[PDB]
């Protein structure tokens, strides 16, 4: 009867206050349709490619409960992978607690890559002053932490790193990120080896990369001289090459501490509003 939809709506209203089970990353676009046989139609949460999705609980085999990561979002019926696959086979047939969901931490790590190589005092004082701002401002929320392991290494002879950074230790650090993100606190990593955003592309962590831009190589020349410069030039020129629209979420091209900190702080407040809907509490 129609009562099952009412019990479903009750399960949803109960779901809205529930803590997140696990976030996932979509690999395909998906629009809602009446043929989808949504248990509670008009509540379906459609998603574009590479959309992030918090998941609260398993409503049923055909549908999971969860929410999209964006402002104004509310709890709803995120489609199950089996349902998406069944609709895929159906459309192909009509044509005549690989897979659609990559696991991601509930809170994305933030890596402030650039201007160039890490481990040198210029860029080190740069990013460190940045973490100082992020710490004193986002007090009681932000959870900055160092990662000695190279997280970029994370993905019938068993795979093994030839580097001192053992892959098992990397797995341990990844689990530490999975635990740290469970608290829904802000996270901003201080990874050492991550000189370029592309290295983290294979990671399931889905990092919030930050781009502290210096468009002019000569400026950074005079900067590093003002206090290993050449490899720093190839690296900075390399980061200059990268596509801003996708590779980076934020460009800290601002020179003074004040305005740049205002931008990145406003950004993190935007993400903070995105990750914490009123209905959750």
């Amino acid at each position: 009867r129609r009562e099952a939809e009412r019990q479903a709506q009750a399960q949803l209203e109960k779901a809205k206050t529930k803590p997140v089970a696990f976030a996932v990353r979509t690999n395909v676009r998906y629009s809602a349709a009446q043929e989808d046989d949504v248990p509670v139609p008009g509540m379906a949460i459609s998603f574009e490619a590479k959309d992030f999705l918090h998941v609260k609980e398993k409503f049923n085999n055909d549908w999971w409960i969860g929410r999209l990561v964006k402002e104004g979002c509310e709890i709803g019926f995120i489609p199950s992978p089996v349902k998406l696959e069944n609709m895929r086979l159906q459309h192909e047939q009509r044509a005549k607690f690989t897979p659609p969901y990559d696991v991601v931490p509930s809170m994305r790590p933030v890596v402030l890559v650039g201007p160039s190589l890490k481990g040198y005092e210029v860029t080190d004082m740069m990013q460190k002053a940045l973490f100082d701002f992020l710490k004193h401002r986002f007090e009681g929320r932000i959870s900055i932490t160092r990662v000695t392991a190279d997280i970029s290494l994370a993905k019938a002879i068993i795979e093994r790193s030839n580097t001192r950074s053992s892959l098992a230790e990397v797995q341990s650090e990844i689990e530490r990120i999975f635990e740290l993100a469970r608290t829904l606190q802000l996270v901003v990593l201080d990874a050492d080896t991550i000189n370029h955003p592309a290295q983290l592309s294979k990671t399931s962590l889905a990092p919030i990369i930050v781009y502290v831009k210096i468009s002019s190589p000569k400026v950074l020349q005079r900067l590093i001289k003002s206090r290993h410069l050449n490899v720093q030039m190839v690296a900075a020129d390399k980061l200059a090459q990268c596509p801003p629209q996708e590779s980076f979420d934020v460009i800290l091209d601002e020179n003074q501490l004040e305005d740049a900190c205002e931008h990145l702080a406003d950004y993190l407040e935007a993400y903070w509003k995105a990750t914490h809907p009123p209905s959750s509490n």
């Binding site: 210029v122 004082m125 002053a129 468009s215 002019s216 400026v219 900067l223 003002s226 020179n255």
Partner: peptide, 29 residues
């Protein structure tokens, strides 16, 4: 006169150093 202006102009039609001073100010912090 303005016609002479348009005549010359019809065919006639610092960030580096600012980045230098501002980023030196950045390391200065």
């Amino acid at each position: 006169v303005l016609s002479g202006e348009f005549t010359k102009e019809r065919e006639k039609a610092q960030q580096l150093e600012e980045d230098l001073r501002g980023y030196m100010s950045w390391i200065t912090q």
